[PDB]
């Protein structure tokens, strides 16, 4: 009942990106440039299907440096991972919630079995707990 | 002698992102959040392998909006496209250069056979006229 580290996530479908700057309510700790990645299974959910067991969403969070009016990606801060399993992750609405510090499998960030993650993602129950929207 | 519209580039490997903000010397026309994509052939060349003919790099440029210390992706402004053909695009260092307004296949932008594009990209002869570097 631990989220598997999503090996190869970096080769998945890039869903969207956002910059969270200092002053954002979520600055600690989602401050930075982030990219959302979906595996094949998660794409079915993003396209308007039911999220199937084995869907994985990853949010990939980088530091950035403001250099002469460019924001330039620096070090990877962490990844967030949502792993679909309606049974095993039933306590958090069928998604397993995990963080990996610097995107390393040995740096698990989640210490409450994902209740805090779920507490915010709950606001999106009607879109199956996923904020990101597919775009061209 | 024309660069093909890179159908499906949104499914390709996401190489990197950067934000160019007001004040940047390249604000016209490179202002916004841009995402770099690489097909399989392009990935070979980015890894320090060589670029096969049919390698395609895309730079996907979005407008952004400020939204309470978040930069949020808005409308697509354009895509830039580099298509590898050592012989056919030999006048511009073996890469064909094209822009598509709003990434629409019908809004081709380049009028000088890509000499303008190649001029800036020539700074990067040492790495085959590619600025982007693979990251983790
Ligand atoms: C609100 C106060 C949040 C808490 C606590 C957590 N997340 Fe979150 N998450 C949030 C938003 C507003 C977004 C969308 C960002 C965007 O670019 O639109 C996200 C996104 C994710 C993603 C990408 C999938 C998606 O739902 O869009 C993942 C994989 C994700 N978040 C995981 C995650 C984990 C593991 C958390 C606990 C450590 C967590 N999030 C907390 C808002 C909030
Ligand atoms: C300098 C003033 C530039 C001119 C004119 C053009 N491009 Fe460019 N390009 C430039 C930089 C500094 C970068 C890297 C951006 C980053 O995030 O690192 C790019 C990138 C591209 C890419 C992605 C591949 C790469 O080399 O990194 C493509 C596909 C690309 N640019 C195409 C392109 C075309 C078609 C142009 C003429 C319309 C063009 N570029 C002009 C700098 C400059
Ligand atoms: Zn403020
Ligand atoms: Zn600035």
Author numbering:
A (entry chain B), B (entry chain A): 3 to 138
Per the authors:
Cytochromes c′ (cyts c′) are a group of putative NO-binding heme proteins that fall into two families: the well-characterized four alpha helix bundle fold (cyts c′-α) and an unrelated family with a large beta-sheet fold (cyts c′-β) resembling that of cytochromes P460. Of these, cytochrome P460 (cytP460) is a heme enzyme that oxidizes hydroxylamine to N2O as part of nitrification (1), whereas the evolutionarily related cytochrome c′-β (cyt c′-β) binds the diatomic gases, NO and CO (2). By contrast, our recent crystal structure of cyt c′-β from Methylococcus capsulatus (Bath) (McCP-β) reveals a hydrophobic distal pocket dominated by two Phe residues (F32 and F61), a structural feature we have named the “Phe cap. Proposed roles for cyt c′-β proteins include protection against NO stress generated during nitrification.
The F61V variant exhibits Fe–C distances of 2.01 and 2.00 Å and a similar bent geometry to the native ligand–bound structure with Fe–C–O angles of 166° and 177° for monomer A and B, respectively. The F61V variant still displays two possible conformations of Phe 32 in the presence of CO. However, unlike the wt structure, where a unique Phe 32 orientation was seen in each monomer, F61V displays two orientations in both monomers. RR measurements of F61V and F32V Fe(II)CO complexes support our hypothesis that the local negative polarity of the Phe 32 aromatic quadrupole limits buildup of charge associated with Fe(II)→CO(π∗) backbonding, thereby weakening the Fe–CO bond. The pair of ν(FeCO) frequencies observed for the F61V variant (483 and 495 cm−1) are similar to those of the ν(FeCO) doublet for wt McCP-β (481 and 491 cm−1), with the lower frequency ascribed to CO interacting with the local negative polarity of the aromatic quadrupole of Phe 32. In line with RR data that indicate a modest weakening of the Fe–CO bond (because of the Phe 32 aromatic quadrupole), the CO off rates of wt and F61V are 1.5 (±0.2)-fold and 2.5 (±0.3)-fold higher than that of F32V. Crystallographic and RR data confirm that NO and CO ligands interact with the Phe 32 ring face in the F61V variant but are unaffected by any aromatic quadrupole in the F32V variant.
